Amino acid sequence: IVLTQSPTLSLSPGERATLSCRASESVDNYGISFMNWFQQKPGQAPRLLIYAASNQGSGIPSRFSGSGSGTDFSLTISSLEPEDFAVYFCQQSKEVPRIFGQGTKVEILK
Amino acid sequence: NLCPFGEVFNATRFASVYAWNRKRISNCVADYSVLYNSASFSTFKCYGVSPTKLNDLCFTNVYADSFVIRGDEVRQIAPGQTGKIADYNYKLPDDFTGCVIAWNSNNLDSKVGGNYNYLYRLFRKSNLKPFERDISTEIYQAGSTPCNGVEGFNCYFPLQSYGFQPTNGVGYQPYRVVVLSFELLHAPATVCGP
Amino acid sequence: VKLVESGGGLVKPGGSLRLSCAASGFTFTNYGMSWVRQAPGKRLEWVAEISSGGSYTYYPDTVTGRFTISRDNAKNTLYLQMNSLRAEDTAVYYCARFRYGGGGTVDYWGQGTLVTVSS
């Protein structure tokens, strides 16, 4: 019922992003697969990434990847592009209002 | 007497498909005017009969075989349709005589957690005879890899459960799907019209 | 793929307002729909859900300002009242389209619309 994300992480191109989606209560569900991932760019309403972390996608670069287990779903990216960072959101589902992540923004120096 | 459609349709839990109920009905007035004309049934058909004529007709076998299926698959339940349903978990003959009914359940039969009581057969080692209930969950062996009473690589636990959200599209909202069937002529009729 | 909204709006707190979303580019009967808000400086609040054919319409509890939702299908259209308009209710609403069932989903999006609850 209570999901959580890491407070902040800032990154650089080529790096492999994993953000901590922190899920209170149960781990996933008896449905064996749940949650989600989303990306909000400025001036661009958010967008599906990979549903149930396990699947997709079309328009979705395979550089996007990950999985999930337990109370923390595992985010994965490879060789980021300096224009492609945006806050990533993981849903709940199957239980309770679905809500979203408190938010964290990949950020690059230089 | 009275024919217990009111306990067929309006009953609480519908069996999942791979074990499909079979409820005979007999020795009663079976009045189709109160069914068909409820007009809440988001589909319908009738095959060897045309639903209005029935009120005057006298059956013997009347078997209401209820079960829940996935919205897009009602199409598969009919004569002449093949696919995961009519082939594996629930057959229909082709020459089969009687109606086919469905109205979405999506208020009830689905939970946000995708109620998993509802489940069906995915991998079976043949394709059913007409009206063969298959209840056996004995594990499936795809290749020559011995399963030996456990899940296995290239082994299969033959059942599969639909995830139903209540929020599914019309396709994956579960439809309650009854069926019926009957003899028509040449046997003494317990069933009747009015 | 294709969606329309109302623009922003101004209402005195305490009242109500009806909000619109206009859909096109698919069969609007066959996809459940949901409103979602973004409170600035706050993570996305998920507003409400509706069924596809006929209304499931379940909300979060929190406290409801008794926002009521319905579809008009022949108009490919979605509607949102919000009664009990209050300060915090200021946010960016969104109308979003689910997909045929899955671990989800929420695919496409209305771009979003401001909320002004003010004197």
**DSSP letter for each residue of A28-51:** S-TTS-----EEEBTTB---B--G
Phi–psi pair at A78, nearest 5 degrees: -140, 130
Give the tokens for residue C97.
């389209």
What does the DSSP 8-state code read for residue B76?
Answer: G
Residues forming beta bridges with residue B62, ordered by sequence position: B182
Place of tokens 């074990």: B19
Q: Which of C29, C5, C27 is nearest to C18 (CA)?
A: C5
Residues forming beta bridges with residue B24, ordered by sequence position: B63
Distance (Å, whole) CA B182 – CA B57 = 11
- Tell me the residues of chain A between 32 and 91 that have a Cβ less than 8 Å away from chain B: none
Place of tokens 């749940």: A34
B138 neighbors B25 (Cβ within 8 angstroms)? no
Separation of CA C34 from chain center: 6
Q: Which of A15, A19, A24 is nearest to A7 (CA)?
A: A19
Phi–psi pair at B134, nearest 5 degrees: -120, 105
Q: Which residues of A78-93 are buried (b: 16+ CB within 10 A; e: fewer)?
A: eebeeeebbbbbbbbb
**CB pair distance less than 8 Å for A94 and B116:** no
Kindly calculate the radius of gyration of chain A based on its CA atoms and give it in whole angstroms: 13
For residue B100, CA distances in Å to A82, B43, B189, C79 come to 58, 8, 22, 35
Q: How far is B6 from chain C (nearest CA, A)?
A: 24
Q: Looking at chain B, which residue has its C-alpha nearest residue C101?
A: B168
Q: Looking at chain B, which residue has its C-alpha nearest residue A34?
A: B113
- Domains of chain B, by residue range, sit at 1-113+166-194, 114-165
Chain A residues in contact with C45 (beta carbon < 8 A): 99
Distance (Å, whole) CA A107 – CA A14 = 13
Q: CB-based contacts of C93: which residues, under 8 Å, 6+ apart?
A: C19, C35, C36, C37, C47, C80, C112, C113, C115
Q: At C104, which CATH number? A: 2.60.40.10
Note down the domain range covering C40.
3-117
**CB pair distance less than 8 Å for C104 and A33:** no
DSSP-based three-state secondary structure for B71:
helix
Q: Which of B98, B5, B84, B88 is nearest to B46 (CA)?
A: B98
- β-strands C2-5, C10-11: how paired? unpaired
Give the tokens for residue C105.
């989903």
A26 inside 8 A of chain B by CB: no
Separation of CA B60 from chain center: 20
Q: Which of C38, C28, C29, C17 is nearest to C80 (CA)?
A: C17
- H/E run at residue B8: helix B5-8
- β-strands A20-23, A3-5: how paired? antiparallel
Longest dimension (CA), chain A: 45
Domains identified in chain C, total number? 1
Distance (Å, whole) CA A56 – CA C84 = 40
Q: CB-based contacts of A75: which residues, under 8 Å, 6+ apart?
A: A17, A18, A19, A20, A21, A37, A66, A88
Give the tokens for residue A70.
């337990």
Give the tokens for residue B106.
């999506």
What does the DSSP 8-state code read for residue B5?
Answer: H
Residues forming beta bridges with residue C68, ordered by sequence position: none
Phi–psi pair at B124, nearest 5 degrees: -125, 155
For chain B, the 3-state helix, strand and coil shares in percent, each to the nearest 5, are: 10, 20, 70
Query: Shortest CB distance from B166 goes to which of C30, C56, C99?
Result: C56
Neighbours of A59 (CB within 10 A): 7
Experimental determination approach used? cryo-EM
B153 neighbors B145 (Cβ within 8 angstroms)? yes
**CB pair distance less than 8 Å for B107 and C32:** no
C60 inside 8 A of chain B by CB: no
For residue B35, CA distances in Å to A40, B32, B40, B51, C19 come to 51, 5, 9, 10, 40
Q: How far is B192 from chain C (nearest CA, A)?
A: 36
Chain B residues in contact with C108 (beta carbon < 8 A): none
- Tell me the residues of chain C between 15 and 54 that have a Cβ less than 8 Å away from chain A: 43-46
Query: Shortest CB distance from B163 goes to which of C30, C52, C101?
Result: C101
Chain A residues in contact with B163 (beta carbon < 8 A): 31
Distance (Å, whole) CA A48 – CA C102 = 13
Distance (Å, whole) CA A30 – CA A7 = 29
Phi–psi pair at B178, nearest 5 degrees: -85, 180
By the 10 Å C-beta count (0-12 exposed, 13-18 middle, 19+ buried), B188 is classed as exposed
Distance (Å, whole) CA B91 – CA B19 = 12
Query: Shortest CB distance from A45 goes to which of C45, C46, C111?
Result: C111
